[PDB]
Amino acid sequence: EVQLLESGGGLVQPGGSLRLSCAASGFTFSIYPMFWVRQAPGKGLEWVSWIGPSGGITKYADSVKGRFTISRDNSKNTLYLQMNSLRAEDTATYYCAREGHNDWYFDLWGRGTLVTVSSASTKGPSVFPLAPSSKSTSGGTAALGCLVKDYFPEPVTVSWNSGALTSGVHTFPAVLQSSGLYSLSSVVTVPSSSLGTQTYICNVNHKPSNTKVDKKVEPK
Amino acid sequence: DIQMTQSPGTLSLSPGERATLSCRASQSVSSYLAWYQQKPGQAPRLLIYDASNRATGIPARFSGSGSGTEFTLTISSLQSEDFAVYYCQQYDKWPLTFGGGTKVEIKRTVAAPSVFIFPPSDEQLKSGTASVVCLLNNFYPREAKVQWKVDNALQSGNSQESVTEQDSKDSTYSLSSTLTLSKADYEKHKVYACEVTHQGLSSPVTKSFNR
Numbered sequence: 001e002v003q004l005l006e007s008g009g010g011l012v013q014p015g016g017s018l019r020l021s022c023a024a025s026g027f028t029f030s031i032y033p034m035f036w037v038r039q040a041p042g043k044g045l046e047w048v049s050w051i052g053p054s055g056g057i058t059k060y061a062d063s064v065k066g067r068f069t070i071s072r073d074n075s076k077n078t079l080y081l082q083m084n085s086l087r088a089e090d091t092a093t094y095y096c097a098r099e100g101h102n103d104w105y106f107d108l109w110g111r112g113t114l115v116t117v118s119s120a121s122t123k124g125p126s127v128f129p130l131a132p133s134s135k136s137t138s139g140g141t142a143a144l145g146c147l148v149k150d151y152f153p154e155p156v157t158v159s160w161n162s163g164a165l166t167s168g169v170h171t172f173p174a175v176l177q178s179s180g181l182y183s184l185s186s187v188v189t190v191p192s193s194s195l196g197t198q199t200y201i202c203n204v205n206h207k208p209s210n211t212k213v214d215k216k217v218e219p220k
Numbered sequence: 221d222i223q224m225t226q227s228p229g230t231l232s233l234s235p236g237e238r239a240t241l242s243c244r245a246s247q248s249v250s251s252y253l254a255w256y257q258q259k260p261g262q263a264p265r266l267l268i269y270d271a272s273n274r275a276t277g278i279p280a281r282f283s284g285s286g287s288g289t290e291f292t293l294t295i296s297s298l299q300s301e302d303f304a305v306y307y308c309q310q311y312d313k314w315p316l317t318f319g320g321g322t323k324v325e326i327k328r329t330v331a332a333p334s335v336f337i338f339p340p341s342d343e344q345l346k347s348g349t350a351s352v353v354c355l356l357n358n359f360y361p362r363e364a365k366v367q368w369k370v371d372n373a374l375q376s377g378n379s380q381e382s383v384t385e386q387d388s389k390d391s392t393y394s395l396s397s398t399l400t401l402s403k404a405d406y407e408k409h410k411v412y413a414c415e416v417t418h419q420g421l422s423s424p425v426t427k428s429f430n431r
Contacts, residue, residue, distance in 0.1 A: 047315060100269065130353055133338070136355075143336045
């Protein structure tokens with residue numbers, strides 16, 4: 001039960017600036033060299049910068065030198081990345097990670113947070129129902145889902161019946177509409193019989209536009 | 221910048237069998253070599269540091285070895301859980317540098333897709349356009365043709381497919397095509413077919429509906 005918890009992602013104008021925190025719960029943060037690591041999609045891992053436990057020594061990748069500042073607050077238990085002057089290629093998932101004693105591999109990693117650097121605007125998703133149907137049914141099992149067009153940026157989250165239903169589910173990767181917006185399906189295979197008794201609600205959550213929405217899926 | 225390079229790049233192995241991945245250094249790195257695992261989409265997990273040395277709480281099957289400029293991580297019994305990319309990382313000289321990743325996929329036995337079809341929904345139609353969803357569920361392996369037809373007309377306008385990540389449980393994949401046309405056009409045509417070719421099928425399969 002040691003974890004880093006990043007937050008502060010989402011959409012940024014080109015030319016702008018944005019910062020993220022890698023708040024850290026399990027361990028004595030204050031003594032640990034920390035570092036930040038990004039990864040553009042369709043590419044791999046690149047260090048971004050590293051900071052001393054001291055707080056007093058920083059180092060910087062040559063793509064971000066003079067433009068980004070790594071920093072920490074020991075008493076608040078937190079790591080920051082103030083990024084300036086962002087470019088579309090800065091679009092990446094940023095992870096922060098902590099340095100293992102003896103020292104220079106990364107001991108423990110946060111989950112990632114996606115910064116999408118675009119001058120396009122946020123547009124909240126539309127949620128439609130993939131009703132379960134004679135043509136969506138197979139034996140003692142039946143397929144339903146919610147279709148999620150059209151939204152921008154790339155991260156949305158769908159859970160079923162508020163996280164009560166978690167398996168049978170597949171929620172597919174978005175695809176980039178020719179629009180320039182996104183669309184995804186989420187789908188769960190449930191017990192045939194239950195179609196009448198049980199009731200299925202998909203909960204879509206898109207944070208860039210606070211758009212939250214439920215969708216009662218029902219047969220026919 | 222010691223530039224790292226990971227050997228196979230992809231690897232498909234049946235669960236049960238031994239898996240062997242390489243990491244070649246552009247100049248000697250000695251013992252200083254980390255190994256990470258990244259299941260999707262979560263946080264890379266350290267598996268092995270110092271080349272030889274397994275991280276705590278990591279299962280015994282994972283080990284690493286090599287030294288100098290040739291290094292190998294090993295999964296003595298590949299297992300369905302283990303589908304991920306594996307990164308090796310360098311740390312002998314500054315800056316820190318990573319490999320490219322080898323994606324490891326768990327080869328399982330042929331599984332044919334159960335194919336479903338979802339017409340548009342009214343509500344969607346209320347607002348301008350129509351999506352027809354075609355779901356392919358629980359198959360292996362991943363290759364699958366999917367054409368759309370509209371009154372037996374071959375479409376090249378216009379779907380976008382998407383596939384899931386290998387199931388860690390049963391190693392199967394799912395896919396979904398989406399024929400997308402304007403409501404205007406959706407009403408112009410009588411029958412909506414999607415047809416699936418897949419290796420686990422003796423021949424191809426259509427799913428249709430009318431209206």
